[PDB]
Design a protein around this nucleic acid. Sequence first.
RNA 1: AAGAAAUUCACGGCGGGCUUGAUGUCCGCGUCUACCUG
Lengths: 78, 326, 326
Amino acid sequence: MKFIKYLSTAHLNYMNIAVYENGSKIKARVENVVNGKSVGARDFDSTEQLESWFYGLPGSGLGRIENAMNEISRRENP
Amino acid sequence: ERKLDPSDALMSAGAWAQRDASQEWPAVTVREKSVRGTISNRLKTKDRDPAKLDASIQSPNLQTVDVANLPSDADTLKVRFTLRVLGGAGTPSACNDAAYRDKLLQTVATYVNDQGFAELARRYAHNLANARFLWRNRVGAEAVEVRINHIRQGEVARAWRFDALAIGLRDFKADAELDALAELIASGLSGSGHVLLEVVAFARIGDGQEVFPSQELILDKGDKKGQKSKTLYSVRDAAAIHSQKIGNALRTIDTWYPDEDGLGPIAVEPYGSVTSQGKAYRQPKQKLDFYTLLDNWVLRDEAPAVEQQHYVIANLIRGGVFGEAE
Amino acid sequence: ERKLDPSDALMSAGAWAQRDASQEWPAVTVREKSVRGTISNRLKTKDRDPAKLDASIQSPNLQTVDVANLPSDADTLKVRFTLRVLGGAGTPSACNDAAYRDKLLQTVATYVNDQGFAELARRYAHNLANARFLWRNRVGAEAVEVRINHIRQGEVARAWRFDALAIGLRDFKADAELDALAELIASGLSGSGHVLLEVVAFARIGDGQEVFPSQELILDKGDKKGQKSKTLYSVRDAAAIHSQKIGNALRTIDTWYPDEDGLGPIAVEPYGSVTSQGKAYRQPKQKLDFYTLLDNWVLRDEAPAVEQQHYVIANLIRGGVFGEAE
RNA sequence: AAGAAAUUCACGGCGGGCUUGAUGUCCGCGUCUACCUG
């Protein structure tokens, strides 16, 4: 639903962050790129926050994708 | 009268050890004592996506950057040594006794029946060709499962030991033996005479096997993989855990049993095509098939379900007794 | 009738070993036995800022301090010896048999079909020019990937061995061979006649390759990097782990397959420009492209998806059979 | 008071960076006594 770009060269698990927009919020549905079954997402404000807390996570380079993936998969927001 | 057991369970007679792969050079074949084990090395990968997609309802913006990127996971891949040509698989399969003496007896009358059937199928049907299935389709080294593929010469050395001393010392060449039909071999009849001396409760028998695939240098293997159930989130890096003994590479006994549980071409469909692993419901895990389905009558769970009442299977008994050996 | 497999999977016939780089001097080229391996050294870098910055929302004083400072880090750059001119890459790629005999068969009728298609495309289309793709675009040493760049003379010595003895002993000069078009070479037709004797199941074939890039002294390399997933926090120093064998520098087999999986200019777009790695979805990892997209019909996952029903691909079959060789 | 279970098929990590700069470690000091390589 109103799909946009990824976060920077998945994979490393066949898992991806796969940010895509909603009409008001933006969902960050951590998912595969094969058959399609995701793990837990998180809904929040626009891309301007998405790059902000995405850059606000530790590690360098690919570890930001991975620590972002573990950070979203233990979600609070249903 | 004489109903089936409410809960029956049988010990895995004809047991099986683990394998410790360790690499060698030919003409140093005989001296496999200080032969070093093969540590599960850790390659780290990058790919494309050769997996397909479901074609029900999609948006075409996905698959361009799905396919286009680098899927790059860490893959712990067991790799050989640099200057080692041979291989290794050290497994003492010891055969227990008591082909049908149970471990649980939810009705003792059914236990007296099944001991009567080991008395019949062990008294009438001699275990010559039976253990010729458990040898001539497990000396032709289905022991070595995926690493059998294109060996120069995969030599099996089934030593056998009373004690620290070892008397039965039989040597082979498992590329001269097929995997679809068991052919007449004299020393294979000696080893099947020895498993005759095992399953019919004659002696302590533990067959120390030392299989030497003479394939090549640094090539890959087929070691038994672990799993990634609730461990692909804490680590979230590995995707194929080649399982380990203390410092070496396993072959899990779970895979190692259908090396030798591959007995019967006594299935419903095939003739000389498929020699599957002799199981209840005869299901192979590869093909997602059910050879000997419920609607057919070549089940293990129809072999005492008919034989415990009516005594007639007629030499498909072997794929209903070897379902009870393991 | 005759639907596709629910879960198909094929063994990587035409396998590939690891490389152990080791450095030499010319006219000592022939005596590459005591040639010492090249340990992955550890340089320690101080950074700069060459990366472009964002265009959405900024403040122009950030690049004063950022472009000022030094985000310095350690990089384990594998460096040559001091007085060694040559190089080394010792890889025994052994070619397995069974070009389309599967490893998983989720429907046996599809397996009989695909064995029929290896019967057609191995009976009708002879593998002369097929293995001329797997040799004339892998003897021109795409084997050596980034270290091919500006060699004096990158000499490939594909020795071939039955045993400890070695009979097929072919020598080359891979700078006299292009990487965009395969040209007519007699000894390349001998080696492709030998991979003809490999993929069509004739002999045990393991090609011990010894590639000698004669570039220079202490220059850098292109060894295969590891990763820094959840290891850039415990150590938090290294940023490029050049992966190791026992005491040497790898080329991971993952990179080493598209040395030889680079087969087909049989793609959608290019003519004589790009000779990519023959894959399902034909995706190169560099360019983030998808040559042979879903909307085009030059997929591997449309080659039996059309050929298993309608038998017509017509010599783009090779980029739909070599997708099954590996 | 558990007994059996082929987890496997394959997989480009690369791409490029000035670590640097500058320096008092010193000051004293009983190893110790004897003893058949048969």
